């Protein structure tokens, strides 16, 4: 019984570490994409204001 629980713990832990590593990579790519688009928004806003 102790050997079975340990095997379960190993599976869960493996899944967890694998997911966390791949999630951090997505979050970083996402934030970068948002900042790039936000910067484009900011340039357009400044040009519109000057024209007005």
């Amino acid at each position: 019984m102790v050997e079975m629980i340990e095997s379960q713990t190993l599976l869960l832990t493996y899944l967890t570490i694998k997911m966390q590593k791949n999630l951090f990579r997505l979050e970083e790519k996402a934030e970068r994409n948002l900042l790039l688009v936000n910067d484009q928004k900011d340039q357009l806003q400044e040009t519109i204001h000057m024209m007005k």
């Binding site: 688009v37 936000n38 484009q40 928004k41 357009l44 806003q45 040009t47 519109i48 024209m51 007005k52």
Partner: protein, 49 residues
């Protein structure tokens, strides 16, 4: 999604304003004489009053 919507709206606004500026520049060359005309008019009034 929010950012996409905002950029689209701003682009539409920018085109509209560009059309309005092109109509206004056909009138402006002669501005180099404003401060001088105001002071001239003020001076004429001061003389009369």
């Amino acid at each position: 999604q929010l950012l996409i919507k905002q950029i689209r709206d701003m682009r539409s606004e920018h085109v509209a304003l560009q059309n309005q500026q092109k109509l206004a520049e056909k009138v402006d060359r002669k501005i180099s004489d404003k401060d001088e005309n105001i002071q001239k008019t003020r001076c004429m009034w001061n003389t009369i009053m």
